[PDB]
Amino acid sequence: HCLPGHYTPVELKPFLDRPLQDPNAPGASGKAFKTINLNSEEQKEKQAGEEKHCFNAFASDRISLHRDLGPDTRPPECIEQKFKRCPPLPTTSIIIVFHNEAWSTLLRTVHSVMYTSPAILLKEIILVDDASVDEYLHDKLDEYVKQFQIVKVVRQKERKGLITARLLGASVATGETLTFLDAHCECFYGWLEPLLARIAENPVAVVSPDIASIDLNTFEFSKPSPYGHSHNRGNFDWSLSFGWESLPKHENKRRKDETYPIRTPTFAGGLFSISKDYFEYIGSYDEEMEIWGGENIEMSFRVWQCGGQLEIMPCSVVGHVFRSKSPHTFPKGTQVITRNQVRLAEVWMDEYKEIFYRRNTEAAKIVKQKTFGDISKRIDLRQRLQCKNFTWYLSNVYPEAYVPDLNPLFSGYLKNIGNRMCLDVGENNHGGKPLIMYSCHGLGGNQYFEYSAHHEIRHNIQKELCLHASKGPVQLRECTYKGQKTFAVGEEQWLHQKDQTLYNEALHMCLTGNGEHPSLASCNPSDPFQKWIFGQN
């Protein structure tokens, strides 16, 4: 089965040949489509699309299903890379899960895969319908897709969400590998070979493309740059949200060219390839997780702790329509996401789970009322595979991570006697911006604060941020205290006094909850707006 040499370009020719495109058509070569100067019926269609899909479906419906993405702008070593015939490139089953996807976006995903994926690799495309309502996604889709011969639609009759749908897809797949894609993606040139070649080399590797943004408003594709730019890897924050960060210096040094894998603490988890056998062996997904949320983080910890590796291959580029809001209904509310996170925290995070429970009150409650369900199959899997503990994961996989204290001196919320609202970090804050007052919700999150031995008031979900005194509005800034060497600057040291005032040690002034932004004022023990409760949840 194992031949000498490298696959030829003829051996790699795609399943379907892209027709030469009209260069002046809308969205051509992946450039912006500006949908402006619309008549009254058109402006109606656009708002209907935006509100159905939480992307500009009006734009998507006017762009070819066949659009090229212009010239291949990947690094030169990616365009030149050859693939050995031994071990052979494995076959793949493409699994696209959808729930009420637009036609234009679902079929541009399917067309993209056929135009960019070598015929010799592409065994089948499985479309998993998670109980879509739209009639066009029933018989119309079944019939349209027959022409392609290798495309099958599988139906999840009752809405069970993305996790159950992927397990359904996997159970019918016969490929040697599974490649998962969302239903609003577009494959770049040569995206598949580098994923599948890496699994051929190392079958415990779970590999992701370097995911590109497709703009939800204009459908512009963010193209790779040829000169070794800043890459992102996946992380988690201590609310267990997926996030992106710069690579550390040791990884830049280790990677000699762009064909080298990037080791990633977490993966976005929509777009990746895996050995089918390894997917099953390493515990596929927790079947009790519902709708959306947590499974990518759960899979990240489980792969790493149980002896696999999570990798991003920058020679593999796939565009994704990133949204700001879900279009999806939640049959039994968004509590589902928090239950999914408690399930992964109980199984994988050991003592570190308490750091998350403190920051998401809803999760602390689910633990206390034991409504997160039976995890005995997940516990059993962690034992049978002899997976390492979370201390090992933080040390060996994510040594760069800020880890809060397991048992901080104090955590909770800051409630103002005067106006009966809570100190809130606001919608968007990672440096610089003033804070707000917001209704006390007791949920933690944006109202979460810790008190340190060194008199700091921390907001430490993502970064180690410290309440930072100023002549005007109070800020969150990076703590200057970060262990052995360093100290705590007076602008970040506070005393909660007997009169319930918050007294900054540097400025000798008191936090008031008056105005839009809490600021420092002359200390007035009779001012209710300078009186703070440090409430525990």
């Binding site: 995911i211 992102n232 976005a268 929509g270 949320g293 990133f322 809001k325 879900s326 999806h328 939640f330």
Partner: peptide
């Protein structure tokens, strides 16, 4: 009263 970071239920872009 937002129940999470604004409009969660989506993966953030890079």
């Amino acid at each position: 009263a937002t129940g999470a970071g604004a409009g969660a239920g989506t993966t953030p872009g890079p």
